[PDB]
Design an enzyme around this catalytic site. Structure first.
Site, PDB file in Angstrom:
ATOM      1  N   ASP A  35      13.737 -10.156 -37.570  1.00  0.00           N
ATOM      2  CA  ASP A  35      12.783 -10.978 -36.826  1.00  0.00           C
ATOM      3  C   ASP A  35      11.571 -11.405 -37.652  1.00  0.00           C
ATOM      4  O   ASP A  35      10.636 -10.627 -37.834  1.00  0.00           O
ATOM      5  CB  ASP A  35      12.321 -10.199 -35.578  1.00  0.00           C
ATOM      6  CG  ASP A  35      11.512 -11.046 -34.619  1.00  0.00           C
ATOM      7  OD1 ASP A  35      11.959 -12.166 -34.281  1.00  0.00           O
ATOM      8  OD2 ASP A  35      10.432 -10.589 -34.183  1.00  0.00           O
ATOM      9  N   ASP A 219      11.000 -18.649 -37.218  1.00  0.00           N
ATOM     10  CA  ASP A 219      11.398 -17.401 -36.578  1.00  0.00           C
ATOM     11  C   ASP A 219      12.903 -17.168 -36.438  1.00  0.00           C
ATOM     12  O   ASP A 219      13.565 -17.783 -35.604  1.00  0.00           O
ATOM     13  CB  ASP A 219      10.722 -17.326 -35.202  1.00  0.00           C
ATOM     14  CG  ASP A 219      10.987 -16.016 -34.486  1.00  0.00           C
ATOM     15  OD1 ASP A 219      11.390 -15.039 -35.150  1.00  0.00           O
ATOM     16  OD2 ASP A 219      10.778 -15.965 -33.255  1.00  0.00           O
TER      17      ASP A 219
END
EC number: 3.4.23.46
Lengths: 376, 4
Positions: A35, A219
């Site tokens: 992440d 992201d």
């Protein structure tokens, strides 16, 4: 020695990509989601319906308690737990072992996904956005401080086998063409600045500040390409107009309803390509990355008679700025060059194919007043 | 997925 890390990722855009890691002594194996949108390293440390296994501090002799609680809320999903440290390794990564901070997840809400295959999360963003505060050194920061692993990593996400996370470098066999770099505006999220947007070669003609309201980030932990309200609406209006000769179910443009076509008859040609221009490395210079419909139409299994090709609109609305998610990253090799505060893009070796079109990273382009595209 |  990066070959040992090639193909070390599994998963898909819809449920995230994960890398295998070990924690504790003796080493406890767990799959950890990559992440770039957060900065906390956390693993399930308590039973959960969606967890097939979890971190057992009791079985690790090297586990140390920090006597501090913690919680991390995400755009969607959240969890809370107890802080502590332990030895962490990455089997298919650099041959080193480091003592890093680890949040033992004791309770969670809509965080773990059914059948994702990962039991933890690896926040690769900067300490500035780590919870409870920036004093909790992020995993990558620990790795670079305790070892000789260079301060940078790259991600090659491949949609639909898996992907690669090259820790400490760039593997040239994973991309074609030239690498184009955009500055990391600020070290918190991996924030970048979009300076121009075109759909099928048509400028959206919006104040470029709209593209980065209130910011733009890269992201790997987000599935879609999420855009601010203003931008999202203009994009949909343009995409709809381009494919107006096709009829779509209700809720399709909301990333909700699924759409299908006869096996192999998906009319990609009616869907436009999207070009995102990013601030470059030199004055008045930018470059663009082009997205094909194969990227923003995420393939999903047919709820009933799995025979036709079904997809979900992978472009959605955001209220916290632009988010360049997995569907966008899948078409390219992305270099998170922390050492030089920049993010590089290059066509991925595993890019999805199209007959009359192709994803690309092109430059240079001249773009004046790019600094005014940033939001304050 | 929509990960801080």
């Amino acid at each position: 020695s990066f070959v040992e890390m090639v193909d070390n990722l599994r998963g898909k855009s819809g449920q995230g990509y994960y890398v295998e890691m070990t924690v504790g002594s003796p080493p406890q194996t767990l799959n950890i989601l990559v992440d770039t949108g957060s900065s906390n390293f956390a693993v399930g440390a308590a039973p959960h319906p969606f967890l097939h296994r979890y971190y057992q501090r009791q079985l690790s002799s090297t586990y140390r308690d920090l006597r501090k609680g913690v919680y991390v809320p995400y755009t969607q999903g959240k969890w809370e737990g107890e802080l502590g440290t332990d030895l962490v390794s990455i089997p298919h990564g650099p041959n080193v072992t480091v003592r890093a901070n680890i949040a033992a997840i004791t309770e969670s809400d809509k965080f773990f996904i059914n059948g994702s295959n990962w039991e933890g999360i690896l926040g690769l963003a900067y300490a500035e956005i780590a919870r409870p505060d920036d004093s909790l050194e992020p995993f990558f920061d620990s790795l670079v401080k305790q070892t000789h692993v260079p301060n940078l990593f790259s991600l090659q996400l491949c949609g639909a086998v898996g992907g690669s996370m090259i820790i400490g470098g760039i593997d040239h066999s994973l991309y074609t063409g030239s690498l184009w770099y955009t500055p990391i505006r600020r070290e918190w999220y991996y924030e970048v600045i979009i300076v121009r947007v075109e759909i099928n070669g048509q400028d959206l003609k919006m104040d470029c500040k709209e593209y980065n309201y209130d910011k733009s980030i890269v992201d790997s932990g987000t599935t879609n390409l999420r855009l601010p309200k203003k931008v999202f609406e203009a994009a949909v209006k343009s995409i709809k107009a381009a494919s107006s000769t096709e009829k779509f179910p209700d809720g399709f443009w909301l990333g909700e309803q699924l759409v299908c076509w006869q096996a192999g008859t998906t009319p990609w040609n009616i869907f436009p390509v999207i070009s995102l221009y990013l601030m470059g490395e030199v004055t008045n210079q930018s470059f663009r990355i082009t997205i094909l419909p194969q990227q923003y139409l995420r393939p999903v299994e047919d709820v009933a008679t799995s025979q036709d090709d079904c997809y979900k609109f992978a472009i959605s609305q955001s209220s916290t700025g632009t988010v360049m998610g997995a569907v966008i990253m899948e078409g390219f090799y992305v270099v998170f060059d922390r050492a030089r505060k920049r993010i590089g893009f290059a066509v991925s070796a595993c890019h999805v194919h199209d007959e009359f079109r192709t994803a690309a990273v092109e430059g240079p382009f001249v773009t004046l007043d790019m600094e005014d595209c940033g939001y304050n | 997925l929509m990960x801080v």
